Amino acid sequence: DLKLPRQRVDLVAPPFVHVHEQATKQGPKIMEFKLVVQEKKMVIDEKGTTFQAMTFNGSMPGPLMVVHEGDYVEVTLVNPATNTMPHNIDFHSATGALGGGALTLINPGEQVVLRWKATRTGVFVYHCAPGGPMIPWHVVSGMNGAVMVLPRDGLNDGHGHSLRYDRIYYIGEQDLYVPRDEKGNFKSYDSPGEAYSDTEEVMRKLTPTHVVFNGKAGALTGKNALNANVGENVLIVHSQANRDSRPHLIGGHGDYVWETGKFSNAPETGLETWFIRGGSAGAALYKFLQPGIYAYVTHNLIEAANLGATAHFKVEGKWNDDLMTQVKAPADIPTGSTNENLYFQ
Amino acid sequence: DLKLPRQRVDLVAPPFVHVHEQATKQGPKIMEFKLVVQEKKMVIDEKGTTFQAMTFNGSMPGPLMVVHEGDYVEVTLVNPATNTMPHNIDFHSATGALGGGALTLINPGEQVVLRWKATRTGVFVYHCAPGGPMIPWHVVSGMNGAVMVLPRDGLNDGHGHSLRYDRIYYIGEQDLYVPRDEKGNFKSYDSPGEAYSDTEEVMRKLTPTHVVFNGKAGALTGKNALNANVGENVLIVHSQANRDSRPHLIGGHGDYVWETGKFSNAPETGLETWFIRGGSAGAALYKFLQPGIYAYVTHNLIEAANLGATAHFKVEGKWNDDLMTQVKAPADIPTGSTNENLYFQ
Amino acid sequence: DLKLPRQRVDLVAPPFVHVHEQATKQGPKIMEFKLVVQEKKMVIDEKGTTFQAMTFNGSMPGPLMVVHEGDYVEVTLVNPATNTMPHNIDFHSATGALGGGALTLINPGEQVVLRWKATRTGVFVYHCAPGGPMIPWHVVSGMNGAVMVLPRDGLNDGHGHSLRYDRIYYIGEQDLYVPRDEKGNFKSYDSPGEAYSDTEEVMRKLTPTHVVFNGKAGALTGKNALNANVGENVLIVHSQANRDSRPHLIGGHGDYVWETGKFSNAPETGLETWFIRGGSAGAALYKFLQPGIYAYVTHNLIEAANLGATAHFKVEGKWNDDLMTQVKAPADIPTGSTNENLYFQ
Numbered sequence A, B, C: 001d002l003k004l005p006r007q008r009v010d011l012v013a014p015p016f017v018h019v020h021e022q023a024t025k026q027g028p029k030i031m032e033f034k035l036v037v038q039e040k041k042m043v044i045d046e047k048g049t050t051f052q053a054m055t056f057n058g059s060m061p062g063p064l065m066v067v068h069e070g071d072y073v074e075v076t077l078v079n080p081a082t083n084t085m086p087h088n089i090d091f092h093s094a095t096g097a098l099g100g101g102a103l104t105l106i107n108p109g110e111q112v113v114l115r116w117k118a119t120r121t122g123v124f125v126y127h128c129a130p131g132g133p134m135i136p137w138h139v140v141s142g143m144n145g146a147v148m149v150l151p152r153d154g155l156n157d158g159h160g161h162s163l164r165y166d167r168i169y170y171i172g173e174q175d176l177y178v179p180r181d182e183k184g185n186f187k188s189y190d191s192p193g194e195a196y197s198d199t200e201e202v203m204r205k206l207t208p209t210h211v212v213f214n215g216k217a218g219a220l221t222g223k224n225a226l227n228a229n230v231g232e233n234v235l236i237v238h239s240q241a242n243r244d245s246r247p248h249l250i251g252g253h254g255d256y257v258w259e260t261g262k263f264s265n266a267p268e269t270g271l272e273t274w275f276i277r278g279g280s281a282g283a284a285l286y287k288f289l290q291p292g293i294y295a296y297v298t299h300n301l302i303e304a305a306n307l308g309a310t311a312h313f314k315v316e317g318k319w320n321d322d323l324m325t326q327v328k329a330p331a332d333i334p335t336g337s338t339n340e341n342l343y344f345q
């Protein structure tokens, strides 16, 4: 009889995060979460390609859950009767029973309640894992998200100093494997089950057709760019449940980065690009110092520009010409430099 | 005239490890090992696909060798007359002569004796490297293993505390490149030499057809699952001589992980998934806290489930419901939750 | 009005590095550099395959720039009128305006001057990034290099001890995506623009046709091998602007390695193989202890041996038989060992 107070949590869709505290004086709680599996067709690129997705709570990625070390996490996983196949959930944050997967298999029309103790700090992947070849297929169909287990005293730099974020975003990256017809056009299917055989053939060759943030090419650009302001310290949680990624903030840095994502380790400082090993989450803090657009990418630039994996930040504030300035705008090349410039051919 | 006592070592087949000490009061020794190259056809998957393998001591991976810092490692490498081509050995643990490869080239019917000083602690790859295109081909045909050079005082956590394992397993991961015919069926060959040209064509495209532990899909499952017990601290050495991997213990963690595999560095704590850069070995300690089956995978789940790269641990002991419990078994979704659940579509 | 002394820098072609100091007593300077874009056909492999390359200063990689923390870096970027398209430059070392790219777009016949403050220590990638799909294309056509921002007191080991190199080399690794005809032969084009569509198709499948150091297979072998001597501490800077790499010095180690490349972090010690995440630079120090040839590779050995990614060091000095020796040259296998050797089949 676990005799701890209960605390409900209201999840929100990525890239935003439910309300939470960093440092807390609360004691351990039973933190109550609900995830509802949704099988649904989704648009994944700017040309309108559709996909038979499988998700937690209707999004790719599933929502970020936030708890503190020593909390107990009680998850009600629901599999609506309109879905077509069994699902479960594996928390990489949890200990035992294949992360929970061996205790959460549910058919359409069922729900189950799992409790796991948050004994390990960091950001962690969660994902569906029904068994055998269905494990990769459910994951790369969209059934993955992340959970953050904060120390009770919040984050620190590993050298005795507290670190605090003013804003948090969760960037879930998804590798997708979309069959093509003989002409090269992406194929559409009327159900996930119908897509499976052709999709497995693409999966086998290990080369995604799309690599996207928040479920679709362009999802976090334009009207949906991520907002920030000069002076704000922003935590960027990045997950990839199946395949490596190399995040980079174009025009910025990672001031403090937990590449492997685990807060019992000191973060690395001043990174250009970091590395999220497939099957994990990591996190980076950065304090914005300049206004403007920033692109946030995986720095395989082919994947970023051509397969979907670019987000934007729109940062308001005043430009700092000490950090960077255009000394001279574009102008003619002086003819007096001709010889000198021939040495650099 | 190196005047140190000699100590023979009797190698055993992976994933087990020859008898050794962690901390030792022995002084430096000439540690004597023998490796015998074996070219042999091997079954690599559950459908019975065969492969012309090339191995050290008849296994994929070659056996784990264990010594201590400051030992000298005297290796007799033997190339039986029934083999068909030259072989050698490169120790990433060693200094000079291309790791030993430039001193160990032997034809069928020859043996050679190499000695190297174990000046660097950690787990390290060893592999054949005859020269030019034969280097990748011999490696991805199976000619790679690992050596562990322990500190004399055993492992520590980088923060002044000793770490000791109760059990050790060596997981060698192998990327394989098996030609297919026009219909997609894997092709068989009567000798390694006959397989070479078609195999190089597959290698060139950098996408393995199989990714296996201990030489074959399913090798470390079923009857050959890895045994452990709740309370035991288990060291899991993982190597990959040619290609990256991202190990994960499903239902567990890496309590202490040397991702780059080198014991002069403190391990990272509490990892979900780690990263073995191709051409290296790493190691993870984990103390089992729950009984049951665990899967140990590379967390490209396509490779794990569909190309062969899953092992199992079978852990005996008592379940701990404080760490994880099924609060409610699968049940109907209440109709009273309909509206609420519509917000998660 | 930034009132600091100016210091010109004379760049040199990789793998060599312009003259510089490690520790310095100079105060902050405006360090003046010029890069001139060159579009040019280049030979990329030993069979004479040509490529429509795009470069900074005529080389792949672009030259290494070296400054100290707190310097201001004033770069004149020149786009000669004989080139065919716009170019710019993004410094991962810089803060704001997409690393400089949003302030440096120039047409053929133009030059621009950008200044950025070197507030972050480490080795960093710089690369062209005109916008959209041109970003990966310009990068994988050769438009990338690196900049090193040294602490003013030079490098240290993270444990209060200075580290100093006697020699520095910059190894830029380039993934190339060369179209083939129906027979498999590489195709030639009369301009970069003409190559683009076919090249993008290769890029999309994420598998390079070539992986090269210093712009071509064999560039840093034979007459162009890298020289060193026993006793010298050599810094090896490695960059990869678009794709992961796993450097390894065959016969050596990384004594001190900044895998993520950022000197505010302590280096790792005694690595066999390290990992350069695509979009970054890293660096390794190694003190040579044995003479001879060393190969320096990415340890995907297929890429190293078969797609171009092998360099050599030629190290002069005296062999140390204590570290490694051939105890017995190749000889017959004794018939007295037959039984014993049957246990290793």
Ligand SMILES: OC[C@@H]1O[C@@](CO)(O[C@H]2O[C@H](CO)[C@@H](O)[C@H](O)[C@H]2O)[C@@H](O)C1O
Pocket (backbone or CB within 6 Å): A165, A166, A167, A229, A232
């Ligand atoms: O609009 C952003 C911004 O809001 C300020 C309030 O004056 O801080 C607010 O937003 C940040 C970013 O979400 C949060 O960290 C604070 O909790 C919240 O009060 C502010 O500086 C400003 O102009």
Ligand SMILES: OC[C@@H]1O[C@@](CO)(O[C@H]2O[C@H](CO)[C@@H](O)[C@H](O)[C@H]2O)[C@@H](O)C1O
Pocket (backbone or CB within 6 Å): B165, B166, B167, B229, B232
């Ligand atoms: O059967 C495993 C198990 O054996 C015990 C002995 O009582 O420890 C033994 O095995 C472990 C795992 O190999 C080793 O570390 C010990 O050296 C060995 O004595 C035990 O707890 C038990 O039931």
Ligand SMILES: OC[C@@H]1O[C@@](CO)(O[C@H]2O[C@H](CO)[C@@H](O)[C@H](O)[C@H]2O)[C@@H](O)C1O
Pocket (backbone or CB within 6 Å): C165, C166, C167, C229, C232
């Ligand atoms: O020829 C290499 C070598 O040169 C010595 C000078 O006696 O050092 C010189 O070269 C190294 C490697 O570039 C530099 O670090 C020194 O600055 C330079 O003086 C030497 O030991 C030797 O035989």
Ligand SMILES: OC[C@H]1O[C@@](CO)(O[C@H]2O[C@H](CO)[C@@H](O)[C@H](O)[C@H]2O)[C@@H](O)[C@@H]1O
Pocket (backbone or CB within 6 Å): A047, A049, A183, A184, A185, A186
């Ligand atoms: O990529 C193969 C080839 O297929 C075509 C259609 O025949 O386009 C497909 O692939 C493109 C790259 O992924 C997508 O942009 C497009 O949506 C898809 O139809 C050809 O245009 C292309 O050359």
Ligand SMILES: OC[C@H]1O[C@@](CO)(O[C@H]2O[C@H](CO)[C@@H](O)[C@H](O)[C@H]2O)[C@@H](O)[C@@H]1O
Pocket (backbone or CB within 6 Å): B047, B049, B183, B184, B185, B186
């Ligand atoms: O994968 C191509 C295609 O080949 C076939 C046989 O024609 O199966 C081959 O590939 C499968 C996936 O690797 C293997 O399971 C099988 O052993 C091999 O024959 C087709 O079944 C498959 O669609």
Ligand SMILES: OC[C@H]1O[C@@](CO)(O[C@H]2O[C@H](CO)[C@@H](O)[C@H](O)[C@H]2O)[C@@H](O)[C@@H]1O
Pocket (backbone or CB within 6 Å): C047, C049, C183, C184, C185, C186
């Ligand atoms: O690789 C496909 C096939 O193409 C051929 C020419 O028809 O060779 C091409 O590819 C080789 C491997 O990349 C290169 O060495 C060569 O330069 C290129 O023409 C065939 O020889 C090869 O089997």
Ligand SMILES: OC[C@H]1O[C@H](O[C@]2(CO)O[C@H](CO)[C@H](O)[C@@H]2O)[C@@H](O)[C@@H](O)[C@@H]1O
Pocket (backbone or CB within 6 Å): A096, A097, A098, A102, A103, B290, B291, B292, B293, B319, B325, B326
């Ligand atoms: O003996 C079964 C106990 O374990 C259960 O968790 C799992 C269920 O799938 O049981 C084994 C552990 O031995 C599996 O590997 C899982 O870890 C518990 O819920 C429990 O009630 C059991 O007593």
Ligand SMILES: OC[C@H]1O[C@H](O[C@]2(CO)O[C@H](CO)[C@H](O)[C@@H]2O)[C@@H](O)[C@@H](O)[C@@H]1O
Pocket (backbone or CB within 6 Å): B096, B097, B098, B102, B103, C290, C291, C292, C293, C319, C325, C326
């Ligand atoms: O001068 C040859 C000495 O080196 C030998 O090791 C190798 C042999 O292949 O020799 C060079 C080093 O210069 C190669 O690169 C290897 O390191 C030693 O065995 C030795 O006896 C020599 O004197």
Ligand SMILES: OC[C@H]1O[C@H](O[C@]2(CO)O[C@H](CO)[C@H](O)[C@@H]2O)[C@@H](O)[C@@H](O)[C@@H]1O
Pocket (backbone or CB within 6 Å): A290, A291, A292, A293, A319, A325, A326, C096, C097, C098, C102, C103
């Ligand atoms: O308001 C424009 C200011 O920014 C300029 O740098 C860039 C130019 O492309 O401007 C925005 C920042 O808001 C872009 O994202 C870049 O960072 C400066 O040169 C400056 O003069 C401006 O005032």
Ligand SMILES: [Cu+2]
Pocket (backbone or CB within 6 Å): A054, A086, A087, A088, A128, A129, A130, A138, A143
């Ligand atoms: Cu599912």
Ligand SMILES: [Cu+2]
Pocket (backbone or CB within 6 Å): A090, A092, A125, A127, A279, B248, B250, B299
């Ligand atoms: Cu998982």
Ligand SMILES: [Cu+2]
Pocket (backbone or CB within 6 Å): B054, B086, B087, B088, B128, B129, B130, B138, B143
């Ligand atoms: Cu061999």
Ligand SMILES: [Cu+2]
Pocket (backbone or CB within 6 Å): B090, B092, B125, B127, B279, C248, C250, C299
């Ligand atoms: Cu090697």
Ligand SMILES: [Cu+2]
Pocket (backbone or CB within 6 Å): C054, C086, C087, C088, C128, C129, C130, C138, C143
């Ligand atoms: Cu350009």
Ligand SMILES: [Cu+2]
Pocket (backbone or CB within 6 Å): A248, A250, A299, C090, C092, C125, C127, C279
């Ligand atoms: Cu970049």
